[PDB]
């Protein structure tokens, strides 16, 4: 079958140098005149920057002169003025050209610091420019006389050399010279010489540059490009519609600067033609040629040179080198607690305007409207019927909600529209956590999933209810926020004595019936008969009932708790954490739907009982310690004691300072732990006896304790004194703020407080941008990484143990191993007993089985060790997702990894967020520790010059290794003792490169993850090891070859490519010629630099250099990646489109 010619669905893309004839191919005419339009009849002047003949008609299917105006005549070229009558859109398509009188250098290739003409000719830049401007001659193919080929001469020198040799010697100057140079160049011969010369002389300096240049040359050869094309003969002109002359109000016009530039080029070129036909002296024509060069250079890239300015406007004209979406909206948002988790309140008018085409279609579908026009007129009139029609089109049609600071994927979520009277969008409360959206006037945007696939994608993926879990960690993101948790807290709780204390009831029903009638208090100690279930039988619910000692409120609440959950979960005090673990266990037991509806009911009851609770905040609710003033007085005794000591000279200045600052710092804690006790347990009440005391029912304490809002620090700032603020200088004042907010703050205290507040504001405002930037670098380094294979089937993995830092368990084993697959079957303390067989996803039950037994460690497969090339296998990755099931095939994990790492990054403050940045960047620390290069006994050699050399002595092996260690740095290593490779030869931080090379891949992959997780966990942030492990996988992506037999020696190359080539070379080919390598750690920003697709690289990297460097190589972008396919505007090679791209990829490179 004949392949094809006319437009199909294309694959890949190719970029290369353009031939003069190739350029003329695109051009449908030459633009010979600087003129644009006629100035009266605004029609385009023929063959000019704007032309109907060359480019296209000014109006659809209408000839310029107006001869053929009919839609019938089409392929007709008019006789008066040749214009094919066709849509005006082809004036946005057809290109043009200009034939340059003299050759002109292409500025991108001339100066883009790989000066391409230069390093292709092995000729320095200044010589090339000195030639181009006629400031000197350059030899070309000098033959056998006196002179080198690339050698440059001057006026006198050239004259003399010419007088000596008339022929068999050649020299030119200007652009023509460079062109002749390039054209004359034979790549083959140069190659043949370079190889021999490479082989003969042995020096690093020589053969390094030699091999680099021969590689460059052969690359350029295989490219298909020819050197001449770097020098411009024909100059293409951009379609007129892309540089519009379009009019405006008041008769005035507006136009692109490209018209000014192109006009300059045309004029100078024409003047050059004339000056050639007029036989001007050289001094003139040379100047005209230089001016033409300037004009062309300014037209292409005006960045360089002197930056020519547009007419009458100082601003430099924008050169050639120099998204809004329909069906959408936005507005202020409100609560709507009545909503189910799966829906959101959508304003009537908004929904009307959004679904307008759907409304038209349905309206004339049922026959309510004669035609679409009539439909428009109807909804424009807003006739009463159309509303009901809207209710039809809204029902199963989801909408997308999005907020401004989008970080993690939950930043956009799909809901089901519920028509609302008002202009505000009602957003479900439980989702307010995911969006990070307060109600203080934040706005949200709506989108409409038009195509069927978009609706189903919205419902099965982007839906609210389908994501109940944070992608960062398995913990529920639907956890009730504030009002609700204060509701369940006030509900589930007990005081010492109340109505119905001690009585007994048949069940929750008459418990609630007792409460609602005012007979029994919401919180009272009561025994009630409850029936709790358990699914502990195989796939089956077991029922049991008993007398539980609980409170009326907990009994009432139990009515909501579904099925197999134990009563024990609602028998606590029900704080925010317990109320979260409730939902979590509910999810890992009953499944999704029960968890959803449970969550809803939890919110409703929360708001309800919080409303009934009558919880408020008064000024007397904040209790200042009675002993505060006394503590103040005592510490204030200390300060003058130390003052009197400084006056007697017993203590120094700095010592006095530290002492006073310490005594105040202690005073703060004293007052804090006074007010805390007083605000906590001080309620003293009586049941049938004298007294007894319990946790206070004081309002603000309830809020802070429940987890609704407020915290011990802030409560500390309300009641007790607040801190000891500090100037911007960083120095901390030894006279702290003794007054609190409840008390009045005098002028000073507040003044000094202002700073702290502002620096807080400024710093937060800055860390926003920092977090964002980090997320950007992170998604750039990952991106295209997506689950591709299913199971790579490697036994390889990392050893998981609890962190055990300092004292007991800074992080458990169960957490680290949860949701992860086992590398190999682990054992009980006794063996021939396989509890967890081979590779099995470790879920809740499994981890609990591991917890039953005493197991201290589990080997776990990771994304960093996965044998799959160009991606990750689902088996190795893990489970975690919005769903508890194992990761799907084709889900893009790099994006979510980066998002999950960067989203909490706002909450981060050596240490802090910049520490995370330095970590991912692989940067060597300021004053690092040096590890032992090789095991064996060591000794200190030589003496003091700049360094004192350390000589290693391996037992069996040789001792070529001697490392020169600067001696002014205090050492660690014992000069009389042996040290293993990767031991401490000094203290201080260690470069991850060293950890990788000397210790191991798993060693360094553990170092990074543990360090960054130290940074996050110190701030109380949950991020699964997974994401960081994928970022690490991306960091170590490259490697440097050591041995040979296939590829070049020092080449940095993909571990994927390499491993693929050696595993392929271990068999077939040479028996094994396979080459060794060395894994290499690359900082995220550096690893992001490496991308196969040039369209991808042209985005985030520097555009010019990328396009040029790719163009000279004739690089062919096969797409295959996310970014490039986004740019080109086709389905992402992941997720839903993964099937497509899969299928297609297989159809390609095949029969």
């Amino acid at each position: 079958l004949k392949a094809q010619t006319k437009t199909e669905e294309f694959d890949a893309i190719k970029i290369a140098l353009a031939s003069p004839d190739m350029i003329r191919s695109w051009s449908f005419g030459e633009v010979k005149k600087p003129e644009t339009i006629n100035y009266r009849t605004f029609k385009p002047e023929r063959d000019g920057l704007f032309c109907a003949r060359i480019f296209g008609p000014v109006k659809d299917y209408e000839c310029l002169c107006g001869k053929y105006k009919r839609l019938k005549h089409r392929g007709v070229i008019c006789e008066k003025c040749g214009v094919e009558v066709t849509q005006t859109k082809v004036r946005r398509e057809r290109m043009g050209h200009i034939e340059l009188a003299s050759p002109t250098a292409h500025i991108w290739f001339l100066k883009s610091l790989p000066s391409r003409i230069g390093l292709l000719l092995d000729m320095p830049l200044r010589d090339i420019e000195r030639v181009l401007y006629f400031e000197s001659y350059v030899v070309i193919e000098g033959g056998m006389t006196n002179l080198e080929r690339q050698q440059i001469l001057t006026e006198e020198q050239y004259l003399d050399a010419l007088e000596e040799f008339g022929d068999e010697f050649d020299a030119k100057m200007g652009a023509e010279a460079i062109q002749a140079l390039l054209k004359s160049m034979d790549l083959e011969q140069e190659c043949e010489q370079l190889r021999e010369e490479l082989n003969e002389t042995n020096s690093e300096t020589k053969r390094k540059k030699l091999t680099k240049r021969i590689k460059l040359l052969e690359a350029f050869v295989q490219s298909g490009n020819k050197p001449e094309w770097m020098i411009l003969t024909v100059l293409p002109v951009l379609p007129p519609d892309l540089r519009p002359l379009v009019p405006l109000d008041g008769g005035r016009f507006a136009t692109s600067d490209l018209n000014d530039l192109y006009r300059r080029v045309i004029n100078r070129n024409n003047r050059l033609k004339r000056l050639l036909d007029l036989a001007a002296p050289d001094i003139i024509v040379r100047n005209e040629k230089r001016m033409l060069q300037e004009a062309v250079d300014a037209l292409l890239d005006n960045g360089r040179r002197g930056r020519a300015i547009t007419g009458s406007n100082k601003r430099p004209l924008k050169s050639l080198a120099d998204k809004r979406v329909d069906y959408s909206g936005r507005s202020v948002i409100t609560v709507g607690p009545y909503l189910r988790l799966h829906q959101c309140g959508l304003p009537k008018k908004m929904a009307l305007e959004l679904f307008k085409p759907f409304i038209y279609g349905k309206l004339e579908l049922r026959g309510l409207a004669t035609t679409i026009k009539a439909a428009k007129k109807m909804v424009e009139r807003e006739e009463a019927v159309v509303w009901d029609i809207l209710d039809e089109v809204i029902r199963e049609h989801p909408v997308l909600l999005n907020r401004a600071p989008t970080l993690h994927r939950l930043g956009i979520q799909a809901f089901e529209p519920v028509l609302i009277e008002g202009k505000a969008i009602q957003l479900h409360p439980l989702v307010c956590a995911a969006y990070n959206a307060d109600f203080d006037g934040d706005q949200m945007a709506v989108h409409v999933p038009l195509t069927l696939e978009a609706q189903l994608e919205a419902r099965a993926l982007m839906m609210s209810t389908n994501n109940i879990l944070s992608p960062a960690n398995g913990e529920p993101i639907i956890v009730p926020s504030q009002d609700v948790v204060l509701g369940l807290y006030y509900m589930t709780r007990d005081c010492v004595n109340a109505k119905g204390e001690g009585m007994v009831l048949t069940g929750p029903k008459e418990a609630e019936r007792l409460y609602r009638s005012g007979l029994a208090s919401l919180h009272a100690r009561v025994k009630v008969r409850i029936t709790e279930y358990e699914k502990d039988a195989n796939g089956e619910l077991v029922a049991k009932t008993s007398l539980k000692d609980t409170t009326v409120g907990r009994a009432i609440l139990w009515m909501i708790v579904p099925k197999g959950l134990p009563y024990s979960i609602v028998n606590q005090a029900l704080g925010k954490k317990a109320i979260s673990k409730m939902l979590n266990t509910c999810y890992r037991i009953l499944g999704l739907k029960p968890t959803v509806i449970f969550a809803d009911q939890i919110m409703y009851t929360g708001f309800a009982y919080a409303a009934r609770s009558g919880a408020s905040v008064g000024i007397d609710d904040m209790v200042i310690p009675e002993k505060k003033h006394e503590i103040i007085s005592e510490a204030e005794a200390e300060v003058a004691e130390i003052q009197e000591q400084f006056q007697s000279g017993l203590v120094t200045a700095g010592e006095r300072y530290n002492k006073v600052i310490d005594i105040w710092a202690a005073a703060n804690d004293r007052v804090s732990k006074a007010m805390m006790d007083n605000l906590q347990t001080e309620t003293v009440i009586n049941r049938d006896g004298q007294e007894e005391k319990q946790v206070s029912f004081n309002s603000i304490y309830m809020m802070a304790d429940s987890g609704a809002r407020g915290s011990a620090a802030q409560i500390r700032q309300l009641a007790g004194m607040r801190g000891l603020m500090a100037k911007p200088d960083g120095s901390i004042i030894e006279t702290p703020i003794t007054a609190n907010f409840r008390e009045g703050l005098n002028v000073l205290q507040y003044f000094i407080s202002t700073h702290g507040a502002r620096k807080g504001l400024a710093d937060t405002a800055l860390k926003t941008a920092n977090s964002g930037y980090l997320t950007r670098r992170l998604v750039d380094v990952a991106q295209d990484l997506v689950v591709t294979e299913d199971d790579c089937g490697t036994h390889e993995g990392i050893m998981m143990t609890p962190v055990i830092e300092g004292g007991d368990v800074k992080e458990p084993l169960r957490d680290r191993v949860l949701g992860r697959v086992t590398a190999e079957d682990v054992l009980k303390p006794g063996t021939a007993d396989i509890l967890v067989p081979r590779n099995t996803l470790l879920h809740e039950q499994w981890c609990d089985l591991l917890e039953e037994n005493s197991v201290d460690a589990v080997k776990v497969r990771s994304v960093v060790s996965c044998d799959t090339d160009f991606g990750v296998c689902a088996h190795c990755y893990g489970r975690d997702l919005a769903r508890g099931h194992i990761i799907n095939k084709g889900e893009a994990i790099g994006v979510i990894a980066a998002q999950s790492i960067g989203e909490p990054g706002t909450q981060l403050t050596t240490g802090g967020l910049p520490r995370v940045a330095d970590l991912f960047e692989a940067r060597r620390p300021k004053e690092p520790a040096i590890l032992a290069e090789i095991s064996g006994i060591v000794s200190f050699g030589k003496e003091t010059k700049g360094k004192r050399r350390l000589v290693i002595t391996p037992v069996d092996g040789s001792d070529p290794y001697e490392e020169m260690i600067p001696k002014w740095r205090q050492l660690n290593v014992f000069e009389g003792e042996r040290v293993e490779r990767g031991d401490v030869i000094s203290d201080g931080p260690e470069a991850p490169h060293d950890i990788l090379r000397l210790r191991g891949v798993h060693a360094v992959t553990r170092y990074i993850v543990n360090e960054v997780q130290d940074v996050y966990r110190l701030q109380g942030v949950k991020i699964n090891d997974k994401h960081i492990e994928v970022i690490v996988r991306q960091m170590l992506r490259k490697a440097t070859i050591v041995n040979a037999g296939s590829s070049d020696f020092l080449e940095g190359e993909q571990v994927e490519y390499s491993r693929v080539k050696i595993a392929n070379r271990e068999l077939e080919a040479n028996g094994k010629v396979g080459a060794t390598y060395s894994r290499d750690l690359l900082g995220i920003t550096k690893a992001s630099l490496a991308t196969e697709s040039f369209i991808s690289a042209a985005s985030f990297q520097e555009t010019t250099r990328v396009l040029t460097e790719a163009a000279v190589a004739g690089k062919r972008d096969e797409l295959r990646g996310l970014k490039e396919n986004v740019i080109v505007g086709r389905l992402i090679p992941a997720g839903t489109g993964y099937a497509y791209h899969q299928d297609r990829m297989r159809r390609r490179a095949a029969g």
């Binding site: 610091l113 420019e129 230089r290 060069q293 630099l1089």
Partner: protein, 148 residues
């Protein structure tokens, strides 16, 4: 005692960072250009960046930078190279103008006389005037007038 550009380089490397102002003055007196800096910040930035995070490769980012240091004279800006190129040509003497003009006269009169010595150059004019009086042409398109 001398070689300039090493020093801003060798220092910029040892400090690990250099202010955007640090390089400007530390640059040799050779390259002062404004748009010069634009790509050299990228050059130093891939090898040890300070734009006030990079590639540890270095190597060729020095050899080419030294190639940019040798490329630091001619400031391009064709107004300059022109003003200078024409500035060489010597001024004319009042008599020299007469010399040159006389040379012109000799030349042009030579080619005219060479034309007059061609028989076909005569016959053509004759036939053309035969076309003029035949209303196949006009008097203005043949002669601009004789001497007169």
């Amino acid at each position: 005692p001398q070689s300039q550009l090493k020093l801003l380089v060798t220092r910029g490397k040892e400090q690990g960072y250099l202010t955007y102002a640090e390089v400007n003055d530390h640059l040799p007196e050779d390259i002062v250009d404004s748009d010069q800096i634009e790509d050299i910040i990228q050059m130093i930035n891939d090898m040890g960046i300070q734009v006030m995070n990079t590639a540890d490769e270095d190597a060729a980012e020095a050899a080419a930078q030294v190639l940019s240091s040798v490329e630091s004279g001619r400031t391009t800006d064709p107004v300059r190279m022109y003003m200078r190129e024409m500035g060489t040509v010597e001024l004319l003497t009042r008599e020299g103008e007469i010399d040159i003009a006389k040379r012109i006269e000799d030349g042009i009169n030579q080619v005219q006389c060479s034309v007059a010595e061609y028989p076909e150059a005569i016959t053509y004019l004759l036939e053309q005037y035969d076309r003029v009086e035949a209303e196949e042409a006009r008097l203005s398109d043949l002669i601009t007038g004789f001497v007169d």
